[PDB]
Amino acid sequence: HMATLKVIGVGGGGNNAVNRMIDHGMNNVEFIAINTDGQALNLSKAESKIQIGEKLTRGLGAGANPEIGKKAAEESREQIEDAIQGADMVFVTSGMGGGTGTGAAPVVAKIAKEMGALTVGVVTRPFSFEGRKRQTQAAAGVEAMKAAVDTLIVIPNDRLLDIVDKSTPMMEAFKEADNVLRQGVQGISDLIAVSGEVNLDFADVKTIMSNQGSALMGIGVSSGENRAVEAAKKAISSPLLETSIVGAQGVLMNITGGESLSLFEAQEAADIVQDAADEDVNMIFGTVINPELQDEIVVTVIATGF
Ligand SMILES: C[C@@H](Oc1ccc(F)c(C(N)=O)c1F)c1nc(-c2ccc(C(F)(F)F)cc2)c(Br)o1
Ligand SMILES: Nc1nc2c(ncn2[C@@H]2O[C@H](COP(=O)(O)OP(=O)(O)O)[C@@H](O)[C@H]2O)c(=O)[nH]1
Ligand SMILES: [Ca+2]
């Protein structure tokens, strides 16, 4: 078994995220670009492009109307089905609060779910500076997404205002939000490709992520003294995500280190994650020894079930 991964951008923000992943290059991942706006879609370098709702919008965007996004996706349901064929895991990325993403992303997610793919949404909420209407439309989108996916990761754009200085370019801030999806997809790619000393596979991912709701995901990297505790604390901190680890009922956790990775430090790291989660957490723990590493360790966590 080698899980087929597809990453689907829906609407402007979603396609912005996909374009940055295409720019980096991600081997053994299929990228799909979905939009109402034909002009925007023509500029995408995704190898699979679906212009949705041409009869409805005449090739324009949805004008921030989620009903138009929804009806566009429904018009083009068969083309979406065709593009998703063969997927074992689908990431649907979209900015909530507009028209295309808000309306179409839940339709796309439900199609993926009903084809049997493990369906993960990674979505943003609008900045408060965009106003109450955008925020209310986005909230309805988030709820529709939660109903349609297996697991949802939500990034409030306001959290970007906590990690910038007064001069940080807008595009640099956007790259930070993008990195959540990109590093997530990279983690799954590594999990499916590499054989761990304590091995985790795609069935473990499904146990933790299938038919859940909101999730915390994070990665922590440290070296030197107290590296295990530091990396584990960083992994569970995830300042861009609205979901916290507190009370998590399911956890998939991996530790990657060099030959020096000690049993004592593995316990330290796992205890940090455990102490935060629910008393009866279903925790699946993995370990990889990468001999090319020296003093670095990397802790990766996804936490579900709240
Ligand atoms: C770092 C990677 O895990 C591994 C990589 C490489 C491996 F060899 C092994 C292993 N122990 O077999 C392993 F668990 C990983 N990826 C993830 C992960 C990544 C992304 C998500 C998602 F889908 F975005 F939410 C969920 C989980 C986790 Br927890 O751990
Ligand atoms: N973080 C981030 N948020 C974005 C980006 N583009 C758009 N957004 C957010 O996504 C929301 C919807 O915009 P957009 O996706 O362009 O609308 P749609 O094409 O109608 O789905 C906006 O209100 C913003 O909050 C982006 O590149 N990065
Ligand atoms: Ca593995």
Author numbering: 10 to 315
Share the article's original sentences.
The only difference between the two compounds is the presence of a methyl group on the linker connecting the oxazole and difluorobenzamide rings of 2 that is absent in 1. This difference makes 2 a chiral molecule, while 1 is achiral. A racemic mixture of the R and S enantiomeric forms of 2 was dissolved in DMSO and introduced into crystals of SaFtsZ12–316 by soaking. The structure of the R enantiomer of 2 [(R)-2] in complex with SaFtsZ12–316 was determined at 1.4 Å resolution. An extra electron density was clearly observed in the cleft between the N- and C-terminus domains, which enabled us to determine the position and orientation of (R)-2 with an occupancy of 1.0. We have previously reported the structure of 1 in complex with SaFtsZ12–31621. (R)-2 binds the same protein cleft as 1 in a similar orientation to that observed in the structure of the 1-SaFtsZ12–316 complex (see the overlay of 1 and (R)-2 depicted in Fig. 1c). Note that no SaFtsZ complexes were observed with the S enantiomer of 2, suggesting that SaFtsZ is selective for the R over the S enantiomer.
The filamentous temperature-sensitive Z (FtsZ) protein has been identified as a promising new target for the development of novel antibiotics. FtsZ has several properties that make it an appealing antibacterial drug target. It is an essential protein required for bacterial division. FtsZ also has no functional human homolog, offering the potential to target this protein specifically and with minimal toxicity. It is one of the most abundant and highly conserved cytoskeleton proteins among eubacteria, offering FtsZ inhibitors the potential for broad-spectrum antibacterial activity. Lastly, FtsZ is a “druggable” target whose function can be disrupted by small molecule targeting of a single site on the protein.
